[PDB]
Amino acid sequence: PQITLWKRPLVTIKIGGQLKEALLDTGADDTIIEEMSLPGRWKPKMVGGIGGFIKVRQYDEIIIEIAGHKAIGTVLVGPTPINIIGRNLLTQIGATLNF
Amino acid sequence: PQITLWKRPLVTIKIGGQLKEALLDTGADDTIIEEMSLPGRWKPKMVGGIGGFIKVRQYDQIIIEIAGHKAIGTVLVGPTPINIIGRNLLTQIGATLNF
Numbered sequence: 001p002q003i004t005l006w007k008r009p010l011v012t013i014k015i016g017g018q019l020k021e022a023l024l025d026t027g028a029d030d031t032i033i034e035e036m037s038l039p040g041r042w043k044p045k046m047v048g049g050i051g052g053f054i055k056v057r058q059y060d061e062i063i064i065e066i067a068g069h070k071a072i073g074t075v076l077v078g079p080t081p082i083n084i085i086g087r088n089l090l091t092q093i094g095a096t097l098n099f
Numbered sequence: 100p101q102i103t104l105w106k107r108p109l110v111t112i113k114i115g116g117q118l119k120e121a122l123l124d125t126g127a128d129d130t131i132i133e134e135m136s137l138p139g140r141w142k143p144k145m146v147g148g149i150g151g152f153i154k155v156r157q158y159d160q161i162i163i164e165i166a167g168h169k170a171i172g173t174v175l176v177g178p179t180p181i182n183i184i185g186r187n188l189l190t191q192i193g194a195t196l197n198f
């Protein structure tokens with residue numbers, strides 16, 4: 001699809017067997033999802049931006065379906081105020097910014 | 100242009116005759132730039148990011164060029180990790196997300 005930016009570019013995703021809403025975010029280097037259980041090992045990471053940093057769990061090799069497009073990569077899990085699909089997975093679904 | 104997302108989508112902007120670098124951020128509702136002088140009056144604004152909400156200065160009807168496209172609109176000035184062009188000005192320059 002072509003998504004305009006009059007409103008937040010929210011899409012449905014499937015992760016961990018769960019349907020969620022997430023923001024398509026070209027300003028985010030990596031994908032971050034609100035607290036949930038994911039399989040496998042993880043390591044701690046700090047991510048920050050406006051208002052400072054938060055501590056997250058980094059899970060690798062996670063499959064996520066994004067508006068019907070499947071893609072695999074690292075997913076961070078932590079107390080994000082919104083679910084964010086960052087560049088590490090946007091590239092996999094062929095997302096571009098056009099103007 | 101068509102901008103892929105393998106690297107951060109950084110572009111040149113011009114504000115007040117000065118060139119700066121900024122991030123095209125579909126996840127940002129608002130445009131926020133690092134401390135600088137802008138003309139006119141400002142109003143208070145609370146901006147929410149990954150770490151919480153912070154106080155910034157809101158300037159309206161500011162002329163800004165973004166990768167050679169003209170925009171005139173609201174610019175926030177505050178503690179940001181990088182200059183961010185958000186949806187308020189991305190819409191003006193006709194940017195869309197495509198996949």
Ligand SMILES: CC(C)CN(C[C@@H](O)[C@H](Cc1ccccc1)NC(=O)O[C@H]1CCOC1)S(=O)(=O)c1ccc(N)cc1
Nearest residue numbers: 025027028029030048049050126127128129147148149
């Ligand atoms: C600040 C930019 C450079 C980076 N962030 C992405 C931004 O899109 C971020 C996304 C977001 C939306 C709403 C609430 C919370 C976060 N929007 C943001 O702050 O909007 C502010 C700035 C003006 O408008 C409002 S991040 O969330 O800190 C982050 C960093 C690292 C990764 N791996 C993932 C996310």
